């Protein structure tokens, strides 16, 4: 039941992160432009009935609108006062055998 540090080079860890980014852009952040991670610290914890992932993520605003097909490889806005970076911590729970995943808690603060 302990929480261990891990990297993004793990298929499962990546999927959990993608879910956090999607939720950040869809529900938490209200900007017109898409934000993606500048930094990420990850940890995981195995519990009865699933696994929890913990992420400390620093988001940066990109030059892509949230409504355009291609994203992820979107350049970050590099203009003064238009960066709009934010640090968020996410607690994500998944059931590694039922395709179930959800956000348990999160806290964001602009950098």
Swiss-Prot record:
<comment type="similarity">
    <text>Belongs to the cystatin family.</text>
</comment>
<comment type="function">
    <text>Cysteine proteinase inhibitor that possibly plays a protective role against proteinases present in the oral cavity. The order of preference for inhibition is cathepsin S &gt; cathepsin H &gt; cathepsin L &gt; cathepsin B.</text>
</comment>
<dbReference type="GO" id="GO:0031982">
    <property type="term" value="C:vesicle"/>
</dbReference>
<keyword id="KW-0646">Protease inhibitor</keyword>
<dbReference type="GO" id="GO:0005615">
    <property type="term" value="C:extracellular space"/>
</dbReference>
<feature type="short sequence motif" description="Secondary area of contact">
    <location>
        <begin position="39"/>
        <end position="43"/>
    </location>
</feature>
<comment type="subunit">
    <text>Monomer.</text>
</comment>
<feature type="disulfide bond">
    <location>
        <begin position="64"/>
        <end position="74"/>
    </location>
</feature>
<dbReference type="GO" id="GO:0070062">
    <property type="term" value="C:extracellular exosome"/>
</dbReference>
<feature type="site" description="Reactive site">
    <location>
        <position position="1"/>
    </location>
</feature>
<dbReference type="GO" id="GO:0005737">
    <property type="term" value="C:cytoplasm"/>
</dbReference>
<keyword id="KW-0789">Thiol protease inhibitor</keyword>
<keyword id="KW-0732">Signal</keyword>
<feature type="disulfide bond">
    <location>
        <begin position="88"/>
        <end position="108"/>
    </location>
</feature>
<protein>
    <recommendedName>
        <fullName>Cystatin-D</fullName>
    </recommendedName>
</protein>
<dbReference type="GO" id="GO:0005576">
    <property type="term" value="C:extracellular region"/>
</dbReference>
<keyword id="KW-1015">Disulfide bond</keyword>
<keyword id="KW-0964">Secreted</keyword>
<dbReference type="GO" id="GO:0004869">
    <property type="term" value="F:cysteine-type endopeptidase inhibitor activity"/>
</dbReference>
């Amino acid at each position: 039941g302990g929480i261990h540090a891990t990297d993004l080079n793990d298929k499962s860890v990546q999927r959990a992160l993608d879910f956090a980014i999607s939720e950040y852009n869809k529900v938490i952040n209200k900007d017109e432009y898409y934000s993606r991670p500048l930094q990420v610290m990850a940890a995981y914890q195995q519990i009865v009935g699933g696994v929890n992932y913990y992420f400390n993520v620093k988001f940066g605003r990109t030059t892509c609108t949230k409504s355009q097909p291609n994203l992820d490889n979107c350049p970050f806005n590099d203009q003064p006062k238009l960066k709009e970076e934010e640090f968020c911590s996410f607690q994500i729970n998944e059931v590694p055998w039922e395709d179930k995943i959800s956000i348990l808690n999160y806290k964001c603060r602009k950098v």
